[PDB]
Design an enzyme around this catalytic site. Structure first.
Site, PDB file in Angstrom:
ATOM      1  N   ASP A  19       4.986   9.973  57.329  1.00  0.00           N
ATOM      2  CA  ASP A  19       4.219  10.242  58.539  1.00  0.00           C
ATOM      3  C   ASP A  19       4.558   9.249  59.641  1.00  0.00           C
ATOM      4  O   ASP A  19       4.632   9.619  60.818  1.00  0.00           O
ATOM      5  CB  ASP A  19       2.726  10.212  58.230  1.00  0.00           C
ATOM      6  CG  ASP A  19       2.295  11.358  57.343  1.00  0.00           C
ATOM      7  OD1 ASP A  19       2.290  12.510  57.818  1.00  0.00           O
ATOM      8  OD2 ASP A  19       1.974  11.109  56.166  1.00  0.00           O
ATOM      9  N   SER A  24       2.735   5.630  64.322  1.00  0.00           N
ATOM     10  CA  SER A  24       1.845   6.272  63.366  1.00  0.00           C
ATOM     11  C   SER A  24       1.494   7.653  63.895  1.00  0.00           C
ATOM     12  O   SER A  24       1.209   7.809  65.086  1.00  0.00           O
ATOM     13  CB  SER A  24       0.577   5.446  63.139  1.00  0.00           C
ATOM     14  OG  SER A  24      -0.325   6.127  62.289  1.00  0.00           O
ATOM     15  N   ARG A  25       1.521   8.651  63.016  1.00  0.00           N
ATOM     16  CA  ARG A  25       1.304  10.031  63.425  1.00  0.00           C
ATOM     17  C   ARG A  25      -0.146  10.481  63.312  1.00  0.00           C
ATOM     18  O   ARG A  25      -0.479  11.561  63.809  1.00  0.00           O
ATOM     19  CB  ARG A  25       2.191  10.964  62.599  1.00  0.00           C
ATOM     20  CG  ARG A  25       2.778  12.108  63.393  1.00  0.00           C
ATOM     21  CD  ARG A  25       3.874  12.816  62.620  1.00  0.00           C
ATOM     22  NE  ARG A  25       4.979  11.924  62.295  1.00  0.00           N
ATOM     23  CZ  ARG A  25       6.247  12.168  62.592  1.00  0.00           C
ATOM     24  NH1 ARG A  25       6.608  13.271  63.225  1.00  0.00           N
ATOM     25  NH2 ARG A  25       7.176  11.281  62.246  1.00  0.00           N
ATOM     26  N   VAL A  26      -1.012   9.691  62.683  1.00  0.00           N
ATOM     27  CA  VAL A  26      -2.419  10.053  62.551  1.00  0.00           C
ATOM     28  C   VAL A  26      -3.283   8.964  63.168  1.00  0.00           C
ATOM     29  O   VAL A  26      -4.404   8.712  62.714  1.00  0.00           O
ATOM     30  CB  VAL A  26      -2.803  10.294  61.080  1.00  0.00           C
ATOM     31  CG1 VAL A  26      -2.428  11.701  60.663  1.00  0.00           C
ATOM     32  CG2 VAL A  26      -2.127   9.280  60.192  1.00  0.00           C
TER      33      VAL A  26
END
Lengths: 56, 57, 126
Positions: free
Chosen positions: C88, C113-115
């Site tokens: 991710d 960071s993707r979240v």
């Protein structure tokens, strides 16, 4: 004032001449390294291909 | 201090010196007519009734 | 069973090299960098079991933090590209920052960071 202006122009002369000379000096070494890198890449690729073909 | 050229003036500015007369923009081929205004200021203020010594660098 | 698990893979480049060793021994045809064909499949199988189960399955979870050892800060290498193509997000550490005494030698510039946001408490988020 006129002495200062003439001296400024002379300083710019010398600085820019040195800049061009350094640029050319960097260029020659960059081209040499580029040629070495290209030769290494092609030779490694060819070796990989021929080994993969002979492996069968 | 009297400086012509803010590019070099900034050194003494950071050296917290007082600027009396400053000239920043002028043509690459300045004339006596162009310098006449600054000369007139230099003889109006900086005159002998106000100033007696100079050292030019 | 509804628990919460964390997993840390200490190296992955070592495992990739071991797989290459085994493939070449078993006389499989090689590919890029003499690596076998399915190194991407290997790492996808590895890292795709990390998931947050739904409530219908019991509410479990399994987070993973794989590591990669780089040589002279090489990011475009085959295995690093393969792994960062799966995860991710990536978090970077830097040799010059570590040598300057800055521990952890975090690099906020390249690390992504993707979240982000959904993984913080409200106070820290604000």
């Amino acid at each position: 004032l006129l002495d200062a202006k003439a001296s400024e122009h002379a300083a710019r002369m010398t600085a820019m001449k040195n800049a061009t000379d350094n640029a050319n000096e960097l260029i020659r070494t960059l081209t040499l390294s580029y040629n070495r890198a290209r030769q290494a890449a092609i030779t490694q690729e060819i070796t990989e291909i021929v080994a993969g073909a002979n492996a069968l | 201090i009297i400086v012509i050229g803010r590019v070099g003036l900034s050194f003494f500015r950071k050296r917290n010196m007082p600027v009396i007369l400053d000239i920043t923009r002028l043509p690459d081929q300045p004339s006596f007519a162009d310098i006449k205004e600054i000369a007139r200021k230099t003889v109006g203020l900086f005159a002998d009734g106000t100033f007696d010594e100079l050292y030019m660098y | 069973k509804g628990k919460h698990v964390l997993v840390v893979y200490a190296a992955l480049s070592k495992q990739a090299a071991a797989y290459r060793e085994l493939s070449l021994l078993l006389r499989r045809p090689p590919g890029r960098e003499a690596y076998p064909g399915d190194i991407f499949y290997l790492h996808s199988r590895l890292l795709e079991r990390a998931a947050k189960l739904s409530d219908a399955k019991g509410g479990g979870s399994l987070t993973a933090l794989p590591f990669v050892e780089t040589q002279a800060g090489d990011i475009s290498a085959y295995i690093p590209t393969n792994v960062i193509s799966i995860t991710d997000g990536q978090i970077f550490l830097q040799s010059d920052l570590f040598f300057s005494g800055v521990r952890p030698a975090i690099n906020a510039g390249l690390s992504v960071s993707r979240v982000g946001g959904a993984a913080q408490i409200k106070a820290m988020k604000k």
